[PDB]
């Protein structure tokens, strides 16, 4: 197992792909994979709003993976915390 | 016959027409009008790629006035920037 | 922190200010801050010449912050890239 | 010209000098320069508490460039990550 524990463990491209899986499982017949991916997303982002980031986007941004990534990046910088794996 | 300050001064159809006009200017005798048009495109879109959206387009997107508009709306939306006027 | 990952995040004045700091750090007894600012400069400008603009000015151009800024301004404009924020 | 891409490029003494300048930059009304140094700090250390290390120090160690450096050193060694250049 090649486990990712924090956001620095990720690159903006790998995180975008994790968000695409979530979108894929959101439309899936069952929520079994979805429930686990949501828990992982909440744990690696450390953002207080949790899954609200996915389900309730602020009016300005959209709920695309890129818009969510931009939201996280901005909030990590604002709070002086490390972001993704820079590349 | 209006001076357009930003993207919110354009409806999407109007912008697609502007792109069509850029195409014709591309084959005109001089670049005098083309250059003013290209500078304006950069100004209103604010996209990092600039005129590359027209000339060295993303492969995962269709090279057409509509493929161009799509990319523009998506990048702006993802980035929290205002889009086109309604029409 | 506030992220400024693009030239459009700076007005020309803020950029001249940035260059003024580089000018100061360039003659300082320590180079630590200088090196961080030089990498930022190259990354936000995207100019193929990089730091040569600061150290090796063209024959009619200056290595003053105002002249380096003018050179970036024209270069991006000529190449269909977005410019400085409003101011 | 080498560019300090990681903590491996810094000896402890250089890093300390870097934090000393960040601490005066707080005196600097150019948050633009300070924000660039802070982004670099967070990037090279990859420590969880990011800028908290400098601003909201744990009252467990000393609030000084040398105290911040010992902690990073400690955390990196505890985490199996590369440390500072020897010198």
mmCIF file of C-alpha atoms in Angstrom:
data_model
loop_
_atom_site.group_PDB
_atom_site.id
_atom_site.type_symbol
_atom_site.label_atom_id
_atom_site.label_comp_id
_atom_site.label_asym_id
_atom_site.label_seq_id
_atom_site.Cartn_x
_atom_site.Cartn_y
_atom_site.Cartn_z
ATOM 1 C CA UNK A 1 0.000 0.000 0.000
ATOM 2 C CA UNK A 2 1.244 3.375 -1.105
ATOM 3 C CA UNK A 3 -0.773 5.528 1.295
ATOM 4 C CA UNK A 4 -1.324 9.331 1.152
ATOM 5 C CA UNK A 5 -1.771 10.867 4.614
ATOM 6 C CA UNK A 6 -1.707 14.594 3.977
ATOM 7 C CA UNK A 7 -2.221 17.123 1.250
ATOM 8 C CA UNK A 8 1.550 17.560 0.698
ATOM 9 C CA UNK A 9 1.550 13.883 -0.191
ATOM 10 C CA UNK A 10 -0.457 14.944 -3.225
ATOM 11 C CA UNK A 11 0.127 16.855 -6.371
ATOM 12 C CA UNK A 12 -2.567 19.127 -7.773
ATOM 13 C CA UNK A 13 -2.979 16.622 -10.629
ATOM 14 C CA UNK A 14 -3.367 13.544 -8.397
ATOM 15 C CA UNK A 15 -5.817 15.504 -6.219
ATOM 16 C CA UNK A 16 -7.838 16.526 -9.281
ATOM 17 C CA UNK A 17 -8.059 12.845 -10.250
ATOM 18 C CA UNK A 18 -9.260 11.925 -6.676
ATOM 19 C CA UNK A 19 -11.994 14.601 -7.116
ATOM 20 C CA UNK A 20 -12.922 13.053 -10.526
ATOM 21 C CA UNK A 21 -13.394 9.639 -8.793
ATOM 22 C CA UNK A 22 -15.648 11.188 -6.235
ATOM 23 C CA UNK A 23 -17.727 12.784 -9.110
ATOM 24 C CA UNK A 24 -17.787 9.351 -10.712
ATOM 25 C CA UNK A 25 -18.935 7.636 -7.464
ATOM 26 C CA UNK A 26 -21.425 10.365 -6.832
ATOM 27 C CA UNK A 27 -23.327 9.234 -9.910
ATOM 28 C CA UNK A 28 -22.731 5.517 -9.151
ATOM 29 C CA UNK A 29 -25.565 3.075 -8.395
ATOM 30 C CA UNK A 30 -24.196 2.500 -4.843
ATOM 31 C CA UNK A 31 -22.349 4.749 -2.305
ATOM 32 C CA UNK A 32 -19.883 2.182 -0.935
ATOM 33 C CA UNK A 33 -16.770 3.491 -2.647
ATOM 34 C CA UNK A 34 -18.093 7.071 -2.396
ATOM 35 C CA UNK A 35 -18.411 6.995 1.452
ATOM 36 C CA UNK A 36 -14.769 5.941 1.789
ATOM 37 C CA UNK A 37 -13.462 8.501 -0.739
ATOM 38 C CA UNK A 38 -15.360 11.288 1.054
ATOM 39 C CA UNK A 39 -13.760 10.322 4.377
ATOM 40 C CA UNK A 40 -10.310 10.389 2.751
ATOM 41 C CA UNK A 41 -10.960 13.815 1.136
ATOM 42 C CA UNK A 42 -12.070 15.248 4.511
ATOM 43 C CA UNK A 43 -8.995 13.800 6.248
ATOM 44 C CA UNK A 44 -6.393 14.992 3.764
ATOM 45 C CA UNK A 45 -7.808 18.489 3.306
ATOM 46 C CA UNK A 46 -8.106 19.412 7.042
ATOM 47 C CA UNK A 47 -10.648 22.067 5.982
ATOM 48 C CA UNK A 48 -13.325 22.636 8.741
ATOM 49 C CA UNK A 49 -16.233 22.651 6.175
ATOM 50 C CA UNK A 50 -15.457 19.004 5.176
ATOM 51 C CA UNK A 51 -17.654 17.577 2.420
ATOM 52 C CA UNK A 52 -19.513 20.959 2.105
ATOM 53 C CA UNK A 53 -16.640 21.900 -0.210
ATOM 54 C CA UNK A 54 -17.908 19.288 -2.660
ATOM 55 C CA UNK A 55 -21.716 19.546 -2.201
ATOM 56 C CA UNK A 56 -22.180 23.287 -1.494
ATOM 57 C CA UNK A 57 -19.801 25.438 -3.545
ATOM 58 C CA UNK A 58 -19.655 29.164 -2.783
ATOM 59 C CA UNK A 59 -21.447 31.210 -5.495
ATOM 60 C CA UNK A 60 -18.297 32.691 -7.092
ATOM 61 C CA UNK A 61 -16.491 29.362 -7.844
ATOM 62 C CA UNK A 62 -17.992 26.329 -9.439
ATOM 63 C CA UNK A 63 -17.976 22.748 -8.318
ATOM 64 C CA UNK A 64 -15.509 21.508 -10.876
ATOM 65 C CA UNK A 65 -12.417 19.725 -9.560
ATOM 66 C CA UNK A 66 -10.334 22.717 -10.539
ATOM 67 C CA UNK A 67 -12.568 25.122 -8.653
ATOM 68 C CA UNK A 68 -12.397 22.935 -5.526
ATOM 69 C CA UNK A 69 -8.591 22.660 -5.836
ATOM 70 C CA UNK A 70 -8.398 26.446 -6.131
ATOM 71 C CA UNK A 71 -10.523 26.751 -3.030
ATOM 72 C CA UNK A 72 -8.297 24.477 -0.992
ATOM 73 C CA UNK A 73 -5.059 26.050 -2.226
ATOM 74 C CA UNK A 74 -6.297 29.486 -1.292
ATOM 75 C CA UNK A 75 -7.485 28.458 2.134
ATOM 76 C CA UNK A 76 -4.098 26.607 2.906
ATOM 77 C CA UNK A 77 -2.132 29.664 1.860
ATOM 78 C CA UNK A 78 -4.332 32.042 3.791
ATOM 79 C CA UNK A 79 -3.686 29.882 6.902
ATOM 80 C CA UNK A 80 0.051 29.521 6.169
ATOM 81 C CA UNK A 81 -0.183 25.738 5.897
ATOM 82 C CA UNK A 82 1.636 23.684 3.256
ATOM 83 C CA UNK A 83 -0.214 23.025 -0.002
ATOM 84 C CA UNK A 84 0.074 20.293 -2.518
ATOM 85 C CA UNK A 85 3.317 18.826 -3.809
ATOM 86 C CA UNK A 86 4.609 21.750 -5.855
ATOM 87 C CA UNK A 87 5.208 21.007 -9.475
ATOM 88 C CA UNK B 1 -21.195 50.862 -31.104
ATOM 89 C CA UNK B 2 -20.224 50.514 -27.474
ATOM 90 C CA UNK B 3 -16.889 50.562 -25.657
ATOM 91 C CA UNK B 4 -16.592 47.132 -23.884
ATOM 92 C CA UNK B 5 -14.751 47.425 -20.522
ATOM 93 C CA UNK B 6 -14.883 43.723 -19.536
ATOM 94 C CA UNK B 7 -16.209 40.222 -20.259
ATOM 95 C CA UNK B 8 -19.521 41.087 -18.565
ATOM 96 C CA UNK B 9 -20.101 43.560 -21.413
ATOM 97 C CA UNK B 10 -20.216 40.604 -23.808
ATOM 98 C CA UNK B 11 -22.876 38.000 -24.336
ATOM 99 C CA UNK B 12 -21.420 34.679 -25.504
ATOM 100 C CA UNK B 13 -22.821 34.990 -29.103
ATOM 101 C CA UNK B 14 -21.183 38.371 -29.422
ATOM 102 C CA UNK B 15 -17.828 36.941 -28.355
ATOM 103 C CA UNK B 16 -18.085 34.051 -30.808
ATOM 104 C CA UNK B 17 -18.710 36.743 -33.495
ATOM 105 C CA UNK B 18 -15.583 38.608 -32.375
ATOM 106 C CA UNK B 19 -13.596 35.339 -32.781
ATOM 107 C CA UNK B 20 -15.037 34.873 -36.261
ATOM 108 C CA UNK B 21 -13.840 38.345 -37.119
ATOM 109 C CA UNK B 22 -10.347 37.527 -35.805
ATOM 110 C CA UNK B 23 -10.315 34.531 -38.226
ATOM 111 C CA UNK B 24 -11.018 36.771 -41.270
ATOM 112 C CA UNK B 25 -8.454 39.290 -40.100
ATOM 113 C CA UNK B 26 -5.977 36.536 -39.995
ATOM 114 C CA UNK B 27 -6.088 36.400 -43.846
ATOM 115 C CA UNK B 28 -6.193 40.194 -44.425
ATOM 116 C CA UNK B 29 -3.393 42.094 -46.156
ATOM 117 C CA UNK B 30 -2.060 43.744 -42.993
ATOM 118 C CA UNK B 31 -2.089 43.037 -39.279
ATOM 119 C CA UNK B 32 -3.136 46.482 -38.152
ATOM 120 C CA UNK B 33 -6.685 45.519 -37.234
ATOM 121 C CA UNK B 34 -5.722 41.959 -36.219
ATOM 122 C CA UNK B 35 -3.340 43.209 -33.568
ATOM 123 C CA UNK B 36 -5.820 45.595 -31.985
ATOM 124 C CA UNK B 37 -8.347 42.704 -31.935
ATOM 125 C CA UNK B 38 -5.825 40.299 -30.387
ATOM 126 C CA UNK B 39 -4.862 42.815 -27.677
ATOM 127 C CA UNK B 40 -8.530 43.218 -26.859
ATOM 128 C CA UNK B 41 -9.032 39.402 -26.660
ATOM 129 C CA UNK B 42 -6.186 39.220 -24.095
ATOM 130 C CA UNK B 43 -7.668 42.071 -22.130
ATOM 131 C CA UNK B 44 -11.123 40.705 -21.794
ATOM 132 C CA UNK B 45 -10.391 37.004 -21.275
ATOM 133 C CA UNK B 46 -7.428 37.393 -18.797
ATOM 134 C CA UNK B 47 -6.509 33.816 -19.432
ATOM 135 C CA UNK B 48 -2.814 32.942 -18.784
ATOM 136 C CA UNK B 49 -2.445 31.384 -22.253
ATOM 137 C CA UNK B 50 -3.486 34.612 -24.040
ATOM 138 C CA UNK B 51 -3.545 34.287 -27.859
ATOM 139 C CA UNK B 52 -2.443 30.619 -27.576
ATOM 140 C CA UNK B 53 -6.158 29.921 -26.987
ATOM 141 C CA UNK B 54 -6.512 30.816 -30.629
ATOM 142 C CA UNK B 55 -3.214 29.698 -32.112
ATOM 143 C CA UNK B 56 -1.692 26.808 -30.203
ATOM 144 C CA UNK B 57 -4.888 25.355 -28.643
ATOM 145 C CA UNK B 58 -5.301 22.680 -26.031
ATOM 146 C CA UNK B 59 -5.527 19.207 -27.637
ATOM 147 C CA UNK B 60 -8.203 18.040 -25.184
ATOM 148 C CA UNK B 61 -10.470 20.833 -26.434
ATOM 149 C CA UNK B 62 -11.844 21.634 -29.904
ATOM 150 C CA UNK B 63 -10.110 24.360 -31.867
ATOM 151 C CA UNK B 64 -13.121 26.484 -32.911
ATOM 152 C CA UNK B 65 -14.745 29.785 -31.730
ATOM 153 C CA UNK B 66 -16.917 27.589 -29.578
ATOM 154 C CA UNK B 67 -14.093 25.382 -28.286
ATOM 155 C CA UNK B 68 -12.398 28.684 -27.367
ATOM 156 C CA UNK B 69 -15.421 30.060 -25.562
ATOM 157 C CA UNK B 70 -15.852 26.833 -23.616
ATOM 158 C CA UNK B 71 -12.359 26.931 -22.335
ATOM 159 C CA UNK B 72 -12.769 30.563 -21.410
ATOM 160 C CA UNK B 73 -16.011 30.026 -19.418
ATOM 161 C CA UNK B 74 -14.591 27.008 -17.619
ATOM 162 C CA UNK B 75 -11.319 28.659 -16.605
ATOM 163 C CA UNK B 76 -13.122 31.787 -15.435
ATOM 164 C CA UNK B 77 -15.771 29.795 -13.513
ATOM 165 C CA UNK B 78 -13.064 27.572 -11.909
ATOM 166 C CA UNK B 79 -11.171 30.786 -11.011
ATOM 167 C CA UNK B 80 -14.057 32.704 -9.439
ATOM 168 C CA UNK B 81 -14.154 35.387 -12.194
ATOM 169 C CA UNK B 82 -17.353 36.855 -13.760
ATOM 170 C CA UNK B 83 -18.481 35.366 -17.082
ATOM 171 C CA UNK B 84 -20.471 36.588 -20.037
ATOM 172 C CA UNK B 85 -23.578 38.778 -19.976
ATOM 173 C CA UNK B 86 -26.830 36.739 -20.362
ATOM 174 C CA UNK B 87 -28.055 35.861 -23.860
ATOM 175 C CA UNK C 1 -0.168 34.406 3.154
ATOM 176 C CA UNK C 2 -1.533 35.912 -0.060
ATOM 177 C CA UNK C 3 -0.411 34.125 -3.151
ATOM 178 C CA UNK C 4 0.718 36.081 -6.185
ATOM 179 C CA UNK C 5 1.374 33.378 -8.730
ATOM 180 C CA UNK C 6 0.885 35.568 -11.744
ATOM 181 C CA UNK C 7 1.812 38.923 -13.179
ATOM 182 C CA UNK C 8 -1.859 39.896 -13.216
ATOM 183 C CA UNK C 9 -1.744 39.875 -9.399
ATOM 184 C CA UNK C 10 0.573 42.905 -9.486
ATOM 185 C CA UNK C 11 0.121 46.482 -10.666
ATOM 186 C CA UNK C 12 3.169 47.909 -12.458
ATOM 187 C CA UNK C 13 3.992 49.915 -9.277
ATOM 188 C CA UNK C 14 3.979 46.844 -7.021
ATOM 189 C CA UNK C 15 6.250 45.173 -9.538
ATOM 190 C CA UNK C 16 8.643 48.166 -9.587
ATOM 191 C CA UNK C 17 8.707 47.921 -5.786
ATOM 192 C CA UNK C 18 9.610 44.231 -6.062
ATOM 193 C CA UNK C 19 12.485 45.163 -8.405
ATOM 194 C CA UNK C 20 13.657 47.828 -5.906
ATOM 195 C CA UNK C 21 13.956 45.111 -3.276
ATOM 196 C CA UNK C 22 15.887 42.870 -5.692
ATOM 197 C CA UNK C 23 18.164 45.902 -6.326
ATOM 198 C CA UNK C 24 18.812 46.252 -2.615
ATOM 199 C CA UNK C 25 19.315 42.490 -1.995
ATOM 200 C CA UNK C 26 21.651 42.303 -4.903
ATOM 201 C CA UNK C 27 24.239 44.451 -3.158
ATOM 202 C CA UNK C 28 23.629 43.097 0.378
ATOM 203 C CA UNK C 29 26.271 41.143 2.358
ATOM 204 C CA UNK C 30 23.898 38.078 2.340
ATOM 205 C CA UNK C 31 22.233 36.428 -0.703
ATOM 206 C CA UNK C 32 19.478 34.358 0.896
ATOM 207 C CA UNK C 33 16.527 36.666 0.217
ATOM 208 C CA UNK C 34 17.998 37.593 -3.213
ATOM 209 C CA UNK C 35 17.816 34.047 -4.412
ATOM 210 C CA UNK C 36 14.206 33.611 -3.435
ATOM 211 C CA UNK C 37 13.214 36.872 -5.156
ATOM 212 C CA UNK C 38 15.129 35.999 -8.338
ATOM 213 C CA UNK C 39 13.229 32.721 -8.716
ATOM 214 C CA UNK C 40 9.875 34.541 -8.164
ATOM 215 C CA UNK C 41 10.834 37.179 -10.768
ATOM 216 C CA UNK C 42 11.581 34.557 -13.448
ATOM 217 C CA UNK C 43 8.426 32.529 -12.593
ATOM 218 C CA UNK C 44 5.977 35.414 -12.705
ATOM 219 C CA UNK C 45 7.456 37.150 -15.701
ATOM 220 C CA UNK C 46 7.832 34.033 -17.930
ATOM 221 C CA UNK C 47 10.384 36.020 -19.980
ATOM 222 C CA UNK C 48 12.820 33.646 -21.833
ATOM 223 C CA UNK C 49 15.804 35.848 -20.813
ATOM 224 C CA UNK C 50 15.011 35.488 -17.098
ATOM 225 C CA UNK C 51 17.413 37.310 -14.821
ATOM 226 C CA UNK C 52 19.477 38.635 -17.819
ATOM 227 C CA UNK C 53 16.963 41.518 -17.842
ATOM 228 C CA UNK C 54 18.160 42.614 -14.478
ATOM 229 C CA UNK C 55 21.921 42.062 -15.021
ATOM 230 C CA UNK C 56 22.461 42.503 -18.750
ATOM 231 C CA UNK C 57 20.271 45.351 -20.112
ATOM 232 C CA UNK C 58 19.853 45.739 -23.861
ATOM 233 C CA UNK C 59 21.675 48.569 -25.499
ATOM 234 C CA UNK C 60 19.050 51.252 -25.259
ATOM 235 C CA UNK C 61 17.389 49.808 -22.205
ATOM 236 C CA UNK C 62 18.045 50.478 -18.554
ATOM 237 C CA UNK C 63 18.586 48.157 -15.578
ATOM 238 C CA UNK C 64 16.451 50.533 -13.510
ATOM 239 C CA UNK C 65 13.274 48.870 -12.007
ATOM 240 C CA UNK C 66 11.133 51.118 -14.162
ATOM 241 C CA UNK C 67 12.989 50.022 -17.342
ATOM 242 C CA UNK C 68 12.965 46.320 -16.553
ATOM 243 C CA UNK C 69 9.200 46.658 -15.954
ATOM 244 C CA UNK C 70 8.654 48.425 -19.262
ATOM 245 C CA UNK C 71 10.576 45.662 -21.057
ATOM 246 C CA UNK C 72 8.355 42.974 -19.401
ATOM 247 C CA UNK C 73 5.249 44.980 -20.218
ATOM 248 C CA UNK C 74 6.117 45.199 -23.933
ATOM 249 C CA UNK C 75 7.351 41.658 -24.182
ATOM 250 C CA UNK C 76 4.151 40.104 -22.835
ATOM 251 C CA UNK C 77 2.000 42.440 -24.949
ATOM 252 C CA UNK C 78 3.885 41.572 -28.101
ATOM 253 C CA UNK C 79 3.538 37.872 -27.328
ATOM 254 C CA UNK C 80 -0.196 37.937 -26.635
ATOM 255 C CA UNK C 81 0.148 37.307 -22.867
ATOM 256 C CA UNK C 82 -1.790 38.991 -20.063
ATOM 257 C CA UNK C 83 -0.248 41.964 -18.302
ATOM 258 C CA UNK C 84 -0.218 43.747 -14.967
ATOM 259 C CA UNK C 85 -3.219 44.239 -12.724
ATOM 260 C CA UNK C 86 -5.061 47.617 -12.889
ATOM 261 C CA UNK C 87 -2.394 50.172 -11.910
ATOM 262 C CA UNK D 1 23.376 29.630 -10.578
ATOM 263 C CA UNK D 2 21.987 27.167 -8.071
ATOM 264 C CA UNK D 3 18.408 27.675 -6.832
ATOM 265 C CA UNK D 4 17.475 26.476 -3.340
ATOM 266 C CA UNK D 5 14.866 23.905 -4.213
ATOM 267 C CA UNK D 6 14.903 22.122 -0.888
ATOM 268 C CA UNK D 7 16.096 22.167 2.753
ATOM 269 C CA UNK D 8 18.991 19.977 1.511
ATOM 270 C CA UNK D 9 20.340 23.018 -0.266
ATOM 271 C CA UNK D 10 20.433 25.021 2.968
ATOM 272 C CA UNK D 11 22.921 24.649 5.756
ATOM 273 C CA UNK D 12 21.494 25.461 9.119
ATOM 274 C CA UNK D 13 23.261 28.843 9.226
ATOM 275 C CA UNK D 14 21.795 29.954 5.919
ATOM 276 C CA UNK D 15 18.261 28.929 7.001
ATOM 277 C CA UNK D 16 18.663 30.792 10.305
ATOM 278 C CA UNK D 17 19.741 33.910 8.320
ATOM 279 C CA UNK D 18 16.689 33.440 6.155
ATOM 280 C CA UNK D 19 14.350 33.396 9.214
ATOM 281 C CA UNK D 20 16.127 36.468 10.619
ATOM 282 C CA UNK D 21 15.280 38.366 7.425
ATOM 283 C CA UNK D 22 11.646 37.091 7.454
ATOM 284 C CA UNK D 23 11.375 38.438 11.009
ATOM 285 C CA UNK D 24 12.507 41.981 9.851
ATOM 286 C CA UNK D 25 10.286 41.679 6.763
ATOM 287 C CA UNK D 26 7.422 41.554 9.123
ATOM 288 C CA UNK D 27 8.652 45.109 9.873
ATOM 289 C CA UNK D 28 8.394 45.468 6.085
ATOM 290 C CA UNK D 29 5.199 47.120 4.891
ATOM 291 C CA UNK D 30 5.775 45.138 1.640
ATOM 292 C CA UNK D 31 3.774 42.054 2.424
ATOM 293 C CA UNK D 32 4.556 41.223 -1.262
ATOM 294 C CA UNK D 33 8.166 40.396 -0.427
ATOM 295 C CA UNK D 34 7.213 38.804 2.934
ATOM 296 C CA UNK D 35 4.568 36.586 1.286
ATOM 297 C CA UNK D 36 7.152 35.305 -1.209
ATOM 298 C CA UNK D 37 9.580 34.398 1.611
ATOM 299 C CA UNK D 38 6.777 32.761 3.633
ATOM 300 C CA UNK D 39 5.667 30.674 0.627
ATOM 301 C CA UNK D 40 9.222 29.539 0.185
ATOM 302 C CA UNK D 41 9.557 28.676 3.935
ATOM 303 C CA UNK D 42 6.394 26.508 3.925
ATOM 304 C CA UNK D 43 7.576 24.880 0.707
ATOM 305 C CA UNK D 44 11.047 23.838 1.824
ATOM 306 C CA UNK D 45 10.181 22.701 5.334
ATOM 307 C CA UNK D 46 6.916 20.929 4.522
ATOM 308 C CA UNK D 47 6.189 21.057 8.282
ATOM 309 C CA UNK D 48 2.512 20.688 9.257
ATOM 310 C CA UNK D 49 2.231 23.912 11.256
ATOM 311 C CA UNK D 50 3.719 25.970 8.445
ATOM 312 C CA UNK D 51 4.049 29.669 9.384
ATOM 313 C CA UNK D 52 2.798 28.931 12.836
ATOM 314 C CA UNK D 53 6.399 27.898 13.558
ATOM 315 C CA UNK D 54 7.467 31.486 13.276
ATOM 316 C CA UNK D 55 4.303 33.276 14.494
ATOM 317 C CA UNK D 56 2.498 31.127 17.005
ATOM 318 C CA UNK D 57 5.484 29.133 18.412
ATOM 319 C CA UNK D 58 4.869 26.283 20.846
ATOM 320 C CA UNK D 59 5.822 27.491 24.310
ATOM 321 C CA UNK D 60 7.830 24.296 24.591
ATOM 322 C CA UNK D 61 10.961 25.459 22.722
ATOM 323 C CA UNK D 62 12.418 28.935 22.305
ATOM 324 C CA UNK D 63 10.821 31.514 20.090
ATOM 325 C CA UNK D 64 13.936 32.324 18.058
ATOM 326 C CA UNK D 65 15.306 31.531 14.541
ATOM 327 C CA UNK D 66 17.509 28.903 16.290
ATOM 328 C CA UNK D 67 14.496 27.410 18.096
ATOM 329 C CA UNK D 68 12.473 27.167 14.822
ATOM 330 C CA UNK D 69 15.436 25.482 13.152
ATOM 331 C CA UNK D 70 15.914 22.871 15.885
ATOM 332 C CA UNK D 71 12.226 21.903 15.680
ATOM 333 C CA UNK D 72 12.213 21.571 11.885
ATOM 334 C CA UNK D 73 15.419 19.531 12.190
ATOM 335 C CA UNK D 74 13.776 17.323 14.832
ATOM 336 C CA UNK D 75 10.507 16.864 12.922
ATOM 337 C CA UNK D 76 12.355 16.055 9.719
ATOM 338 C CA UNK D 77 14.524 13.458 11.444
ATOM 339 C CA UNK D 78 11.480 11.965 13.188
ATOM 340 C CA UNK D 79 9.679 11.781 9.846
ATOM 341 C CA UNK D 80 12.461 10.185 7.817
ATOM 342 C CA UNK D 81 12.901 13.262 5.640
ATOM 343 C CA UNK D 82 16.132 14.774 4.317
ATOM 344 C CA UNK D 83 17.643 17.441 6.557
ATOM 345 C CA UNK D 84 19.946 20.400 6.093
ATOM 346 C CA UNK D 85 23.225 20.469 4.208
ATOM 347 C CA UNK D 86 26.102 19.970 6.549
ATOM 348 C CA UNK D 87 28.301 23.014 7.062
#
